[PDB]
Amino acid sequence: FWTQLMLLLWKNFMYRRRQPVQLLVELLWPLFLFFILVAVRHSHPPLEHHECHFPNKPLPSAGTVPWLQGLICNVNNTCFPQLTPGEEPGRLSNFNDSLVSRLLADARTVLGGASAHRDLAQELLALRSLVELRALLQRPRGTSGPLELLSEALCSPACSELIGALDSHPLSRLLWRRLKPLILGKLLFAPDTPFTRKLMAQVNRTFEELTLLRDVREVWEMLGPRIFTFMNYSWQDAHADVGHLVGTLGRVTECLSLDKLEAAPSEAALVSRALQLLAEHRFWAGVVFLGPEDSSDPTEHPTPDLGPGHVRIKIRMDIDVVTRTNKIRDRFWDPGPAADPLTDLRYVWGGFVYLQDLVERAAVRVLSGANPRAGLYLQQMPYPCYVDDVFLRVLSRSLPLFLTLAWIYSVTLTVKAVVREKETRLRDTMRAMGLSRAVLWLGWFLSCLGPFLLSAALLVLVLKLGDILPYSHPGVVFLFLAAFAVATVTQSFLLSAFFSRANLAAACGGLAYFSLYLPYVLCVAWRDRLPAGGRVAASLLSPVAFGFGCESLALLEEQGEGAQWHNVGTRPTADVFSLAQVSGLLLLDAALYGLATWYLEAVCPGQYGKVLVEEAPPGLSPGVSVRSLEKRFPGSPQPALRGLSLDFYQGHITAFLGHNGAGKTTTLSILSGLFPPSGGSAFILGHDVRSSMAAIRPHLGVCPQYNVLFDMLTVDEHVWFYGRLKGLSAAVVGPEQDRLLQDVGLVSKQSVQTRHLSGGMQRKLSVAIAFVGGSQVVILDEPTAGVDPASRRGIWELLLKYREGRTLILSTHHLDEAELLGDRVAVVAGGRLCCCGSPLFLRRHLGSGYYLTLVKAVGTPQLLALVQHWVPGARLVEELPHELVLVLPYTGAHDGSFATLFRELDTRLAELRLTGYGISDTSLEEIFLKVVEECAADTDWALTRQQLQALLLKRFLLARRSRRGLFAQIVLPALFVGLALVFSLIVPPFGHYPALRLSPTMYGAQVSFFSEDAPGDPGRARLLEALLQEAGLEEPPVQHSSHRFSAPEVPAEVAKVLASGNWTPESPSPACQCSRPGARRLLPDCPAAAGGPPPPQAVTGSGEVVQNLTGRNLSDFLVKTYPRLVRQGLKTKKWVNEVRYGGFSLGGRDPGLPSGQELGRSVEELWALLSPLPGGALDRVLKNLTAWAHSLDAQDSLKIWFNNKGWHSMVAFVNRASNAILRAHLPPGPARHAHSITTLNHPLNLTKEQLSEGALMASSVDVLVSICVVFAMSFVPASFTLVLIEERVTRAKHLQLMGGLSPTLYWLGNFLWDMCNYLVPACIVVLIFLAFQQRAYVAPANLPALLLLLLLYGWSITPLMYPASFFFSVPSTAYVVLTCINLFIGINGSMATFVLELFSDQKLQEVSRILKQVFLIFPHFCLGRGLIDMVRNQAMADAFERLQSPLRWEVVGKNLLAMVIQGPLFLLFTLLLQHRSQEDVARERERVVQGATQGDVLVLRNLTKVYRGQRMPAVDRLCLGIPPGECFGLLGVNGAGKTSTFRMVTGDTLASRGEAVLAGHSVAREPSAAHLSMGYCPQSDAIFELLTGREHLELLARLRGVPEAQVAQTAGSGLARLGLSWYADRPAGTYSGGNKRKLATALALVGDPAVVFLDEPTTGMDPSARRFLWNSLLAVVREGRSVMLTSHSMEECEALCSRLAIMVNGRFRCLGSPQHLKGRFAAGHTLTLRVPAARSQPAAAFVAAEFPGAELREAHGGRLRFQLPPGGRCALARVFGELAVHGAEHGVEDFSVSQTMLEEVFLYFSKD
Ligand SMILES: *[C@@H]1O[C@H](CO)[C@@H](O[C@@H]2O[C@H](CO)[C@@H](O[C@@H]3O[C@H](CO)[C@@H](O)[C@H](O[C@@H]4O[C@H](CO)[C@@H](O)[C@H](O)[C@@H]4O)[C@@H]3O)[C@H](O)[C@H]2NC(C)=O)[C@H](O)[C@H]1NC(C)=O
Ligand SMILES: *[C@@H]1O[C@H](CO)[C@@H](O[C@@H]2O[C@H](CO)[C@@H](O[C@@H]3O[C@H](CO)[C@@H](O)[C@H](O)[C@@H]3O)[C@H](O)[C@H]2NC(C)=O)[C@H](O)[C@H]1NC(C)=O
Ligand SMILES: *[C@@H]1O[C@H](CO)[C@@H](O[C@@H]2O[C@H](CO)[C@@H](O[C@@H]3O[C@H](CO)[C@@H](O)[C@H](O)[C@@H]3O)[C@H](O)[C@H]2NC(C)=O)[C@H](O)[C@H]1NC(C)=O
Ligand SMILES: Nc1ncnc2c1ncn2[C@@H]1O[C@H](COP(=O)(O)OP(=O)(O)OP(O)(O)=S)[C@@H](O)[C@H]1O
Ligand SMILES: Nc1ncnc2c1ncn2[C@@H]1O[C@H](COP(=O)(O)OP(=O)(O)OP(O)(O)=S)[C@@H](O)[C@H]1O
Ligand SMILES: *[C@@H]1O[C@H](CO)[C@@H](O)[C@H](O)[C@H]1NC(C)=O
Ligand SMILES: *[C@@H]1O[C@H](CO)[C@@H](O)[C@H](O)[C@H]1NC(C)=O
Ligand SMILES: *[C@@H]1O[C@H](CO)[C@@H](O)[C@H](O)[C@H]1NC(C)=O
Incomplete structure (x- = not known):
């Protein structure tokens, strides 16, 4: 088990060791991507940012001096890491050390002291502020602009000159960018009803109050000269400084719009005037006081309550200045404060909040009927420290x-x-061999998994x-x-x-x-x-x-x-x-x-997707046995293999004999372990293979038909592997290897260590491998399946060298190989044992005996009596004239009895007139056919015009037969887009700006502040109560007191920490949170459980949370508690919903002097004295000064915190605060519900210059339709190239070339046909667009551009893919590949260009116009983007003038011109690609060289062909002279060079050396003339499957030039010559085997060529059809036309062809007529001898002595054949008695004689 795994792993590693390139690629390629990633990381390192606090921004309602101070000082929005004074609950103003504030405080206290007095000089002298003011006044310029002086103080052509002076400093240039639109703006209000007039008068009162400096000026000029004349360092400096300051202030007032407020009657006139002012750059903002009673509100409710009392306002401004109002929150969350004034804080410098505050204050003043006071401030929440890293x-x-x-x-x-x-x-x-699937799969596991780890x-x-x-x-x-x-x-x-x-x-x-x-x-x-x-x-x-x-x-x-x-x-x-x-x-x-x-792996298993018997050897021992074995495939109800009771014996090379399909391979495989035997027993060596398992394997060796060798493994490694697996030991594998090595003799070849270098000879090694284990039983399958006849000698010699002691069972299909090797033969046909026996026993068991034919140049009875005289038995089967066949009696056949007959015949030959006698042995070929058949029975320009017409006809008839294919490839893509137009009739969302109801409730549920500071005032109580009413809480103020405690419990673990610290609320209460420790990085900040530890009181109303944070450190609380709300939504990090957005804090401390009443009293006292003017201008000024003094108190204020990451957070809470003030000042009752204010936001229309950029956003749904059009139209050309690929794969294209057709004209015909095909979809698309009334498409100017685009796109794209026909050898795959390539190029280019143009924020990416001008060299990109530009051009014109044309050569004209240029060059390229390529034997060889015969139609002269790398010519030094009126024949074994000769003579393949002439026409000089009179029919059946054979014939006849009237009759005759009557109307695709061959032969014959070439005309053809071929060729040769024919059927050549030439290694051997060959060498008789002694000397010695000729033919151990002088004068009877005596003289069992057999001509073929 372990050795098998070791061998498998060694093999898998040996594969990889040999290739040093794939290993390197697989090792280095994965690392390149990560090196690129490392470079990208090195490009952008993370950045760290610390805590920072933002300053305060005041609203105009608070004041004017602080509002200007905020406008200039707070431009830069610089972070401050430390706390700012404005965040403290008491302080409301940041600048305390400012010179202006010091001057104001000093002036107020000085007037207070003066009023107390009525010492003043002593109070005034000790003032640093006065000295600073004097120093600032005495400045000799030194500043770039007056804004620099204003900043230092705080923290008309003249106006244009001042602006130009301000242009010197770019930083002050930004300040003037912020100031100029508001200074020189033109406020407008579309409604001009008297209520809006009152509102705008209220607003205008602010600017009127701002215009009060001129009165103080004029009082200065009228009181100056009085004092100057009265009294005439202090005086001279004071007068000049006051005058200079007054003059400077007046110059400042010179640039004043004053009455910036203007009115318009209608919204349309409003927009037009605003656009004109924007063109003049004099516009700031526009207002609309829409009335809820009007109810003309788009995409919004008409009115909340019926009747008046509700004010609805729209503030329209320039789009470039006001934030885009489509989406609320950013699509990608960012780790930052989101506070950059230039990019995100737009409302501060845009002015939307300023005008919103002014309008809301005017509205509340009008509606309430009282005068509220509330200073509004804007403060930015602080943010933790973070790290920015994308x-x-x-x-x-x-x-x-x-x-x-x-x-x-x-x-x-x-x-x-x-x-x-x-x-x-x-x-x-x-x-x-024994290995199971588990071992192989585990080897796969542990071998493939190597490189991964x-x-x-x-x-x-x-x-x-x-x-x-x-x-x-x-x-x-x-x-x-x-x-x-x-x-x-x-x-x-x-x-x-x-x-x-x-x-x-x-x-x-x-x-x-x-x-x-x-x-x-x-x-x-x-x-x-x-x-x-x-x-x-x-x-x-x-x-x-x-x-x-x-x-x-x-x-x-x-x-x-x-x-x-x-x-x-x-x-x-x-x-x-x-x-x-x-x-x-x-x-x-x-x-x-x-x-x-x-x-x-289990879905498809298994599939690789008569009783006459002789059993009697000298030693009976059934080493192998098969008993009643049977197997049934489920597919066939009849069993594949029937009962097989055949027995085997050791030492006998039993051979299976049968035609293909008899179950031979299945029967051999059943014995091996590959399939389960369905029934019976298969006992081998005494133990069944299934039961014995691995015990039988060391004694069994099997080699199958298919070659089993591993390519990369070397010569010795195969034997090493195949010996180790069988269980052979390590020490003796060397010896077994050496044995098989020299037995095949490949020792030297073992050095090169290659297996795929040597070819053909590998079958010998595969056969030898089966004997590596010394197996007692061997089951080979077709040892000579596909090897050349030159090599079968070695296989025979080895298989006979291993014949003793080892049972060998082989299977061969040839009848010859069933006698040389097989000791017994079993006849199998149709999966059954028809017959069995021995070669000698089989031959003797026939009804007939030994054949003796007697030819005539007297009488049968005399010969019959003579034959009966010498041998009694004499069967007479044949008695026809000219031949007398006599059947000698096999039953009782005697060597001597037959001998005496020839002895007397020779002496009486002359008068008997026999002139020769023929003895014939019973051949084994016919008996095999006899028994099997018996066994089977028992079981049962004028030329061009006709030329272009035919090509179009062929393509036309292709469409008619296949209409389903045409419909899908053509019609369906057109209908694909058509259905999309109806389905895409939804409203296109592209980025238009709707009206957003700016309110706090749109954001959603949240947490809000209502902290209160200094609540010691009854008025503040009303505002504080009112703030809760809008939030949805319970109306009564005491409800919170009724709730009493409304807070969550303090955590217990935090209590100990709080006790450990002091925990004073004002001073820092909690402990510090985690931060960046230097060596580590953190995105958020992680605190402990104690950040603002006690949960502040929380009350829930209607989807809202209100938190009471009074008297608590707000900055620390917010900083500490911020990350805990965010971390819930950091998982997705796309649309983060923060919880706290904005809050209120009721400030109560006032920055200025609390007591302004004394200042007013002093002003009144001054007014009473100093001779007040009767006119009253000074009294007016002093009254307004007293009013300002009253307003100096600022009894109550309010502060608003907002979160910047919410874009519309500021305006919503400003609106909420103003509405709350209105509710507070309104008395309680139902009147509170009646009065309300609603604010909106709607940007203006795009200006023309801004239209020129925003049209890009307008494309919208156009991109979706364009992609569908490109996708639909990118299908057809692949279908165009399908048929061309199909034609080129088959040889029919070369048939058309060999015909009168020229390739260039063929290409042109294809071009015209497929344009005629493509024209229809373009018209279908045009009519589909016109039907649904697309405005861009139906325009009379646009339509010609679209039609030209479609037609030209079809016209030039087609020649792109004709060159692709050569590359791809399969139709279907090329279709998909080219369609995907077209889709890739088109969609990718179009989308890339369209996206690049849209997002040109940086002008560096706009330069891609030159890249597009490069892309115009590609033809498929032109159609895609070209349609995109068409829709937008009409879209702009629909709004540029109503509220130029695609035909002009700039939008699509460049595409059209360049692509028409591209058109013909690809056709030229493919056309160039088509033409890119640029003693009998000796007597005839000398005859052609010496002279040329004009009668010879075909004259080869030193023809030679050399394939690359073979180093030996396929055909070398070939020459021939063929007379016209005869039929030739060429013969050779497979691999001799027949097909190469035919291809060079025909012209398909180039000739390396030599030339051929046909009918006096040289191939090189003029191929076309030679092409006219030749008809070629190869083995390959080059026909068009879809067309029927008849259409083929009329097409070729029309190419031939048959008159049109007689074409049908010619077709009928041509088909009737070779049958095809029933298959005439059937397509060539659905034809049988022989039908295609006979159709191709007829096609070659049609047109009557001078010479007709046929390569293997008969290959598995019915005898009737081949007889028709004989008759047709006989008629042709009767007419006088030469037919060259090559086939392996030897009986055909003898009958018909006049001359035969046999070729080996590309050289002729005989080159003579068949009758000359049959007499020159194929005459005589050959003695056949069987010798078991395996000694050549005893057999050769006596034959050589007896007969002078001692030539050896077919020398083998199994059987020996001899050659002796032909035409012996002595009688044939000499050998028979000589054979009888010499059988005893030297060891020979039996013999047979081969004298002038029918097989003598066949035996002649094999040897030479
Ligand atoms: C509400 O909660 C606020 C939380 O920030 C708190 O703000 C503190 O204000 C005081 C000044 O009034 C400062 O206290 C610092 O405490 C740290 C302790 O680590 C000291 O190191 C630091 O001294 C300096 O700090 C610089 C910057 O940190 C450093 O570069 C110097 O070298 C030096 O070390 C300060 O003394 C600080 O601004 C804030 N931090 C805290 C938590 O103390 C408010 O005081 C509190 N409410 C009020 C107004 O009391
Ligand atoms: C929001 O929180 C503040 C916390 O100050 C609440 O104000 C406090 O409300 C309680 C009644 O619930 C009152 O406390 C009073 O304190 C004085 C001493 O200052 C004591 O003599 C009284 O007997 C009473 O306990 C008072 O209104 C106020 N206390 C202070 C100034 O700390 C406020 O009520 C909360 N918001 C709402 C609307 O409930
Ligand atoms: C500024 O842009 C707005 C975008 O709405 C233009 O308003 C639209 O202008 C068209 C005329 O071009 C008008 O369409 C009308 O719509 C109503 C339904 O609201 C329909 O009943 C009418 O028969 C007509 O089709 C209308 O003024 C308005 N259309 C809307 C609201 O969809 C406005 O004209 C542009 N102004 C300028 C001068 O740029
Ligand atoms: N994959 C298959 N393997 C074996 N037999 C099959 C297979 N498919 C079908 N058969 C059956 O096999 C019989 C036909 O002869 P086969 O057994 O296939 O001949 P064979 O053994 O391949 O022939 P040769 O001449 O030895 S290559 C019928 O019963 C078929 O249904
Ligand atoms: N794929 C191939 N096609 C053609 N010739 C080949 C090929 N491979 C090798 N040859 C060479 O061609 C000769 C063997 O084939 P030929 O005798 O020319 O033709 P053939 O085998 O009779 O052709 P058929 O009948 O079509 S299989 C030798 O010179 C070979 O080396
Ligand atoms: C400076 O101190 C506090 C800080 O807010 C402020 O209230 C006070 O008015 C300032 N003093 C003046 C008048 O400059
Ligand atoms: C608005 O104020 C200007 C002065 O700035 C004045 O001339 C004009 O008449 C006023 N218009 C209205 C409508 O009160
Ligand atoms: C302020 O001046 C205006 C005139 O512009 C006058 O009508 C108004 O009464 C003055 N207000 C006060 C109370 O000083």
């Missing part, structure tokens, strides 16, 4: 793909090797070294890769168990290896949709399981601890498989694959 998701989604791409190659090699050893049956013989280790090493998977231990990953390798090996064997062909299985198994990877890709995208349980079901496929384990590997890799011994059995997340449980599924799937193979 590479880990790349591994999560891409690692399985690279592994499968690396391991496809080994699966291909394994499947090809298994199917190779399966197809050639080299494995099937190993079962007979040598590549897995290298991959693991590369993974660890290349930093792709660091911080992990290689053992755990190896224990997974090895499981995958086992699973894929079993899968490869399962695939190998499907097919029975080598190349097909090798190419197809690699397809099913990849096709099972698709479900993983299809299910990873639908991660949430699939249930948990179905994942295990989908994990049955091995790559799916590998991917599902690889996601867990990557997920554990993120957390800093890769696959390691600590966490092998731990699930990283609730619904991801642990790395351990994946291996179990992989091994279970491998076992399932093994069981599937085990079952599948």
